[PDB]
Amino acid sequence: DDYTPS
Amino acid sequence: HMDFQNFVATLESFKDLKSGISGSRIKKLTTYALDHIDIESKIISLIIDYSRLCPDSHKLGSLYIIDSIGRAYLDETRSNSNSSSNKPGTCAHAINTLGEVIQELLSDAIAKSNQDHKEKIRMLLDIWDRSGLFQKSYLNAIRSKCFA
Ligand SMILES: [Cl-]
Numbered sequence: 001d002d003y004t005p006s
Numbered sequence: 007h008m009d010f011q012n013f014v015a016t017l018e019s020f021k022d023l024k025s026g027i028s029g030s031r032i033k034k035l036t037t038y039a040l041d042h043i044d045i046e047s048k049i050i051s052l053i054i055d056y057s058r059l060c061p062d063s064h065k066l067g068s069l070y071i072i073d074s075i076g077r078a079y080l081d082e083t084r085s086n087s088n089s090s091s092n093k094p095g096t097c098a099h100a101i102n103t104l105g106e107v108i109q110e111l112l113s114d115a116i117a118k119s120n121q122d123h124k125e126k127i128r129m130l131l132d133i134w135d136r137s138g139l140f141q142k143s144y145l146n147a148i149r150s151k152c153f154a
Contacts, residue, residue, distance in 0.1 A: 003029040003070045005077075005133050 013038050017056055026064025036074040046100040057111045065115035066123040069130055076104055076139050105140045112148045128153050
């Protein structure tokens with residue numbers, strides 16, 4: 001459930 | 007339908023995450039923020055205060071919340087050709103409010119983060135500089151202190 005900004 | 011108390015509860019639940027980061031929960035908050043721009047002022051003051059008040063290792067996730075909502079609202083302003091930076095209930099005003107505190111929020115989050123989260127904040131500064139989300143001069147002041 002990571003967050004990687006795109 | 008998700009109401010504002012649900013938004014509060016979701017944000018409150020970040021305390022329970024070891025990392026303070028949840029892609030799916032950030033997406034829920036962002037979808038709510040895009041659907042309720044008419045109350046962006048209390049959405050924005052909450053996520054600002056979440057960043058101010060959350061634990062040190064959760065500072066990074068607080069900036070991801072601001073990144074997600076901030077760039078969703080930034081995309082609206084460019085779709086809609088709107089620059090009503092002082093009109094409450096608008097994306098442009100929400101971004102302006104975030105920009106007035108963003109240097110404080112960055113300085114505190116970087117100072118309280120370990121080396122790994124600092125590097126992730128550096129990456130956000132790159133994206134904010136490239137996307138045009140905040141005034142580059144504000145980000146310059148931060149980047150020159152912490153990342154040069
Ligand atoms: Cl807009």
